[PDB]
Amino acid sequence: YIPEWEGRAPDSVDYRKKGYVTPVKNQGQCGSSWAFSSVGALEGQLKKKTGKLLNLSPQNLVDCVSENDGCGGGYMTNAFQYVQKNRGIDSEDAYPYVGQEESCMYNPTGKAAKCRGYREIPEGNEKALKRAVARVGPVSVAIDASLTSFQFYSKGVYYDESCNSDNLNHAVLAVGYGIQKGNKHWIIKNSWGENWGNKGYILMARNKNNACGIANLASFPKM
Numbered sequence: 001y002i003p004e005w006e007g008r009a010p011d012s013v014d015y016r017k018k019g020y021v022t023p024v025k026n027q028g029q030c031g032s033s034w035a036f037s038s039v040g041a042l043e044g045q046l047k048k049k050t051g052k053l054l055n056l057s058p059q060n061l062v063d064c065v066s067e068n069d070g071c072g073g074g075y076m077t078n079a080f081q082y083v084q085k086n087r088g089i090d091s092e093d094a095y096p097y098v099g100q101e102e103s104c105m106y107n108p109t110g111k112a113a114k115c116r117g118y119r120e121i122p123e124g125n126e127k128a129l130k131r132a133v134a135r136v137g138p139v140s141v142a143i144d145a146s147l148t149s150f151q152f153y154s155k156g157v158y159y160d161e162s163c164n165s166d167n168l169n170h171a172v173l174a175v176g177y178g179i180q181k182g183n184k185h186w187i188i189k190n191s192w193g194e195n196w197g198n199k200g201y202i203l204m205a206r207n208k209n210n211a212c213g214i215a216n217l218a219s220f221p222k223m
């Protein structure tokens with residue numbers, strides 16, 4: 001067997017076709033994009049591990065990941081380490097999202113997935129992020145989403161040269177990649193509801209010198 005960091009990745013990958021991606025969620029006013037990005041990468045690894053997939057609980061992460069700040073931001077790697085230490089993460093149905101930080105309500109009964117660690121993509125290496133998406137699955141990533149051009153995206157492959165790759169303020173999920181009208185892109189799942197962008201998704205420029213810092217905080221959990 002030839003490992004992940006070696007040889008040719010396919011030119012087009014989309015896990016929305018293969019049942020590795022849950023429907024688009026809406027984080028509301030709570031600044032918990034790290035939680036939705038974390039559960040999104042955990043859902044994809046749950047599908048490859050068990051063959052079954054299920055909507056996991058970002059509220060579990062908001063209320064229980066003490067290393068993060070609930071609605072005040074957080075890192076996706078701390079959520080992965082939490083699930084590893086906690087031995088489990090609850091389902092969305094058993095731990096619904098309320099849009100606020102509350103007390104930790106984890107119960108092992110509603111456990112739907114586990115995690116045994118994580119791996120951080122080499123800093124700014126878009127080729128390595130591409131190989132990871134093609135071989136591991138959906139990868140949690142952080143970007144600069146403060147620009148007006150990003151927030152009012154609707155169609156096409158998004159690119160803005162003013163995007164600060166050193167101000168990663170929003171967490172999303174790379175559910176694939178490809179090419180549209182001569183512009184390479186990452187297929188990115190956001191958490192601003194289905195009515196944002198293109199059905200909740202945005203195609204962000206790929207191989208344009210790590211636009212918006214797409215590969216500066218990329219990671220995936222291990223199951």
Ligand SMILES: NC(=O)SCC(=O)Nc1ccccc1C(=O)O
Binds near residue numbers: 007
């Ligand atoms: N042996 C390898 O690492 S090749 C992986 C690969 O297919 N990369 C690519 C494939 C198509 C387009 C762009 C890239 C890129 O380099 O970002």
